[PDB]
Amino acid sequence: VAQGPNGRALAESMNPDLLSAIQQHISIERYASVTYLAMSIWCAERELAGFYQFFDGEAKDEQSHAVHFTQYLIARSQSNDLQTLDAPRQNWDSLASLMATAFQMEADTTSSIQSVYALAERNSDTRTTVFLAPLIEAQIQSEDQFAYLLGRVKFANGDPTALLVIDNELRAGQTQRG
Amino acid sequence: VAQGPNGRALAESMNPDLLSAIQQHISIERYASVTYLAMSIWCAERELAGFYQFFDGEAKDEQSHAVHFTQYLIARSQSNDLQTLDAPRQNWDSLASLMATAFQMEADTTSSIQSVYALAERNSDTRTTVFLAPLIEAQIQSEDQFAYLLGRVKFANGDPTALLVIDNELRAGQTQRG
Amino acid sequence: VAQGPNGRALAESMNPDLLSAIQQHISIERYASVTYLAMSIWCAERELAGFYQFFDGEAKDEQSHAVHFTQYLIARSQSNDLQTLDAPRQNWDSLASLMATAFQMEADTTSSIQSVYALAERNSDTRTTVFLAPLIEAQIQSEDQFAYLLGRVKFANGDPTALLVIDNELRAGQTQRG
Amino acid sequence: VAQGPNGRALAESMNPDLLSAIQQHISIERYASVTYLAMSIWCAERELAGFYQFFDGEAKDEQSHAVHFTQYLIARSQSNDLQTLDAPRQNWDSLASLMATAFQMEADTTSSIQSVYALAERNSDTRTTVFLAPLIEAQIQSEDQFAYLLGRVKFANGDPTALLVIDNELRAGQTQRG
Ligand SMILES: [Cl-]
Ligand SMILES: [Cl-]
Ligand SMILES: [Cl-]
Ligand SMILES: [Cl-]
Known part of the structure; x- marks a missing residue:
C-alpha cells in the first residue's frame, strides 16, 4: 500500500493541478466567509440587524464549507495548504450595492x-x-x-x-422564497 | 339496467349538450389552474414569495376542482373527454394588472x-x-x-x-378578510 | 451584476437550446400528468378503484415534478414558457394495454x-x-x-x-416490489 | 297563527298534491329498506357474509332516510300517513342479478x-x-x-x-371507489 503526500494510505493518486485547484477553492470559500463577515459588520453599522444576523450566519456556513473541502483532501491522503487570506472589501454606498x-x-x-x-x-x-x-x-x-x-x-x-x-x-x- | 356512455350502470341519461358543457367547464378549470401556475411563476420572478406561494396553492386547488368534475361524470356513467389545454397568459406589466x-x-x-x-x-x-x-x-x-x-x-x-x-x-x- | 432573461440577477448564462430543451421537458411531464389522469379515469370507469387511486396520485406527483423544473428555471434566472398541452390518450382495450x-x-x-x-x-x-x-x-x-x-x-x-x-x-x- | 293539518302551528301551507307525493316517497324509501333486508337475507343464505353485512346496513340506513322524511312533514305541520308496505322481491338467480x-x-x-x-x-x-x-x-x-x-x-x-x-x-x- 502506497502513502499519499499527506502521509496516509493512498487509495488513488491525484493530479497535482487538481490538488492545487482544490487548495485554491478552499481559499475562495475562506475569502467568501470573511467577505460575509465584512458585510455583516457593514449592516450592523447601519442598524440593519436582520441583515447583520443573516451575514453572520453566512460567514460561519461558508467557513464550514471550506473546512469540508479540507476534510476531502485528508480523505484523499493529499496535503492541505492553507494560504494567505486577502482582506475583504469593506465599503459600499448602499445595501443594494452590497x-x-x-x-x-x-x-x-x-x-x-x-x-x-x-x-x-x-x-x-x-x-x-x-x-x-x-x-x-x-x-x-x-x-x-x-x-x-x-x-x-x-x-x-x-x-x-x-x-x-x-x-x-x-x-x-425569512431568507428565501420558500 | 342500462349502461351509460362510459360503460357503467346508468341511473339517468344526460342530455349530450349538458355533457359537453360539463366537459368544457373541466377545461376552464384546468385552464384556470395553469393560469394560476403562470401567475405563481411571474410573482416568483419578482421575488414576491408570498404571492408566489398563494398562486401555487390556487393552481393545485383549481386542478382538484377540475378532478372533482371528472368524478361527477364518472358518477353519472358519462364519458370524460380531457381536451387540449391552451397556453396561459404569462406576462403582466404589474401586480395590479396580474x-x-x-x-x-x-x-x-x-x-x-x-x-x-x-x-x-x-x-x-x-x-x-x-x-x-x-x-x-x-x-x-x-x-x-x-x-x-x-x-x-x-x-x-x-x-x-x-x-x-x-x-x-x-x-x-392572511389571504382574505377573515 | 447582469440580469437574466426572466429579470433576476444572473449567476451564469444558459445556452438557448438548453433552455428550450428544459421548457419542452416541462411539457412532457405536464403531459405525463394528464395522461395519468386519463388512466385514473379509465380505471375508475371499470371499478378498478385501486388502480384509479394509484394513477390519481401519479398525476399529482408528475405535475409536482413539472413544477420542480419551473422552479429550476427561476433559480437560473431563465424564462418559463408554459405551452399548449395536447389531449392525452384516453382509450385502451385492457388494463394490460393501459x-x-x-x-x-x-x-x-x-x-x-x-x-x-x-x-x-x-x-x-x-x-x-x-x-x-x-x-x-x-x-x-x-x-x-x-x-x-x-x-x-x-x-x-x-x-x-x-x-x-x-x-x-x-x-x-402495495405498489412496488418493496 | 293558523294550525296545520297535523295540529301544530303552521308556517306555510303545503299543496295537498305535494303532501301526497312526500307521503308516497316515504313509502318508496320504506320499501327500499325492506328490499335491502331481503337482499341481506339472500346473500346470507349463500354464505356471502360481506354482502349480507352491507345490505343489512343499507336497510337500516334507508329506513333512517324514511324517518328523516317523516320528521320534515312534522316540521311543516303536515300529517304523516304510514302506508301498507308491499312485500319485497326475494328471489334472484345470481348475485349479478341481485x-x-x-x-x-x-x-x-x-x-x-x-x-x-x-x-x-x-x-x-x-x-x-x-x-x-x-x-x-x-x-x-x-x-x-x-x-x-x-x-x-x-x-x-x-x-x-x-x-x-x-x-x-x-x-x-371497502364498499366504494374511495
Ligand atoms: Cl439600497
Ligand atoms: Cl402594482
Ligand atoms: Cl388485462
Ligand atoms: Cl354473479
Missing part, C-alpha cells in the same frame, strides 16, 4: 467549484466529480436565495421603510 | 358553472343543479377573496413597500 | 431528461447535469415500479379474479 | 325524490326543494356506489373466487 457584491461572491464560488469539476473530469478523477455534485446543488439554492434577497432589496428602491421591512424578514429567518 | 386577470379568471370560472347550471335547469337534470350548488357557494367566497386581494393591491398604488407588506401577509396565510 | 402505455410514458419521461442531460453536458452546464442527477435516480425507481405493475398485470393474463386481487394491493399502497 | 335490482332500487329512489322536487318547484314550495337538495346529493353518491358494486360483481363474471374476494372487501367496509 447585495450585488454578495450575489457575485456566491456566483463566483460556484464558478470556482465548476472549474475544479471540469479539471477533475479531464483527469477522470471520479471521486472528485462525485464529491462536488452535492456542493454544486447547494450552490444553485444559494444562488436562488441571493438572487431573491438582492431582487427584493432592489425592489425596495432605496426606500428606508421597505428596507426596514426586509430587515425584519431576515431577522425572523 | 391580480385583475386573476379576479377575472375566478369570475369567469363562476360564469362557466352558472351556464352549466342553467343548461341543467332547462333539461331538468336535478342531480347536476344540486351537485353544482356547493361549488357556486365556494365560488362566491373565492370571488370575495380575489376582490379582497386585488383591492388591497390597488390600494398599495404601486408603492413597493406596501406590496412587500402585502406579500408577507400572503406568505403567512 | 399499463404498457403507462410504462412507456414513464420510460419516455426518463429519455427526455437524458436528452436534457446530454445537451447540458455538451454545453458544460454543470448546474443542470448536477440538478438532473437525482431526478434520473428517481426515474430508475419509477421505471422499476411500472415494470413491476405491468408485469404483475400481465401475469394475471386477463383473469378478472387476479386483476381484482392486484387492484386491492394498489388500494392498500 | 345487484342489478339493487342499483335500480337506488336509482328509482332518486327518481321519486326528483318527482317530489319538480312538484315542489311548480308549487314554489322553496322549503321543500331546499330540504331535498342534500338528499339528492347523497343519492348521487349512493348511485356511484351501487354502480361500483354492480360493475365489480359483473367484472367477476360469475367466478366464485372473484365473488369471494369481493365479499371480503365488503365485510372490511
Whole structure:
C-alpha cells in the first residue's frame, strides 16, 4: 500500500493541478466567509440587524464549507495548504450595492467549484466529480436565495421603510422564497 | 339496467349538450389552474414569495376542482373527454394588472358553472343543479377573496413597500378578510 | 451584476437550446400528468378503484415534478414558457394495454431528461447535469415500479379474479416490489 | 297563527298534491329498506357474509332516510300517513342479478325524490326543494356506489373466487371507489 503526500494510505493518486485547484477553492470559500463577515459588520453599522444576523450566519456556513473541502483532501491522503487570506472589501454606498457584491461572491464560488469539476473530469478523477455534485446543488439554492434577497432589496428602491421591512424578514429567518 | 356512455350502470341519461358543457367547464378549470401556475411563476420572478406561494396553492386547488368534475361524470356513467389545454397568459406589466386577470379568471370560472347550471335547469337534470350548488357557494367566497386581494393591491398604488407588506401577509396565510 | 432573461440577477448564462430543451421537458411531464389522469379515469370507469387511486396520485406527483423544473428555471434566472398541452390518450382495450402505455410514458419521461442531460453536458452546464442527477435516480425507481405493475398485470393474463386481487394491493399502497 | 293539518302551528301551507307525493316517497324509501333486508337475507343464505353485512346496513340506513322524511312533514305541520308496505322481491338467480335490482332500487329512489322536487318547484314550495337538495346529493353518491358494486360483481363474471374476494372487501367496509 502506497502513502499519499499527506502521509496516509493512498487509495488513488491525484493530479497535482487538481490538488492545487482544490487548495485554491478552499481559499475562495475562506475569502467568501470573511467577505460575509465584512458585510455583516457593514449592516450592523447601519442598524440593519436582520441583515447583520443573516451575514453572520453566512460567514460561519461558508467557513464550514471550506473546512469540508479540507476534510476531502485528508480523505484523499493529499496535503492541505492553507494560504494567505486577502482582506475583504469593506465599503459600499448602499445595501443594494452590497447585495450585488454578495450575489457575485456566491456566483463566483460556484464558478470556482465548476472549474475544479471540469479539471477533475479531464483527469477522470471520479471521486472528485462525485464529491462536488452535492456542493454544486447547494450552490444553485444559494444562488436562488441571493438572487431573491438582492431582487427584493432592489425592489425596495432605496426606500428606508421597505428596507426596514426586509430587515425584519431576515431577522425572523425569512431568507428565501420558500 | 342500462349502461351509460362510459360503460357503467346508468341511473339517468344526460342530455349530450349538458355533457359537453360539463366537459368544457373541466377545461376552464384546468385552464384556470395553469393560469394560476403562470401567475405563481411571474410573482416568483419578482421575488414576491408570498404571492408566489398563494398562486401555487390556487393552481393545485383549481386542478382538484377540475378532478372533482371528472368524478361527477364518472358518477353519472358519462364519458370524460380531457381536451387540449391552451397556453396561459404569462406576462403582466404589474401586480395590479396580474391580480385583475386573476379576479377575472375566478369570475369567469363562476360564469362557466352558472351556464352549466342553467343548461341543467332547462333539461331538468336535478342531480347536476344540486351537485353544482356547493361549488357556486365556494365560488362566491373565492370571488370575495380575489376582490379582497386585488383591492388591497390597488390600494398599495404601486408603492413597493406596501406590496412587500402585502406579500408577507400572503406568505403567512392572511389571504382574505377573515 | 447582469440580469437574466426572466429579470433576476444572473449567476451564469444558459445556452438557448438548453433552455428550450428544459421548457419542452416541462411539457412532457405536464403531459405525463394528464395522461395519468386519463388512466385514473379509465380505471375508475371499470371499478378498478385501486388502480384509479394509484394513477390519481401519479398525476399529482408528475405535475409536482413539472413544477420542480419551473422552479429550476427561476433559480437560473431563465424564462418559463408554459405551452399548449395536447389531449392525452384516453382509450385502451385492457388494463394490460393501459399499463404498457403507462410504462412507456414513464420510460419516455426518463429519455427526455437524458436528452436534457446530454445537451447540458455538451454545453458544460454543470448546474443542470448536477440538478438532473437525482431526478434520473428517481426515474430508475419509477421505471422499476411500472415494470413491476405491468408485469404483475400481465401475469394475471386477463383473469378478472387476479386483476381484482392486484387492484386491492394498489388500494392498500402495495405498489412496488418493496 | 293558523294550525296545520297535523295540529301544530303552521308556517306555510303545503299543496295537498305535494303532501301526497312526500307521503308516497316515504313509502318508496320504506320499501327500499325492506328490499335491502331481503337482499341481506339472500346473500346470507349463500354464505356471502360481506354482502349480507352491507345490505343489512343499507336497510337500516334507508329506513333512517324514511324517518328523516317523516320528521320534515312534522316540521311543516303536515300529517304523516304510514302506508301498507308491499312485500319485497326475494328471489334472484345470481348475485349479478341481485345487484342489478339493487342499483335500480337506488336509482328509482332518486327518481321519486326528483318527482317530489319538480312538484315542489311548480308549487314554489322553496322549503321543500331546499330540504331535498342534500338528499339528492347523497343519492348521487349512493348511485356511484351501487354502480361500483354492480360493475365489480359483473367484472367477476360469475367466478366464485372473484365473488369471494369481493365479499371480503365488503365485510372490511371497502364498499366504494374511495
Ligand atoms: Cl439600497
Ligand atoms: Cl402594482
Ligand atoms: Cl388485462
Ligand atoms: Cl354473479
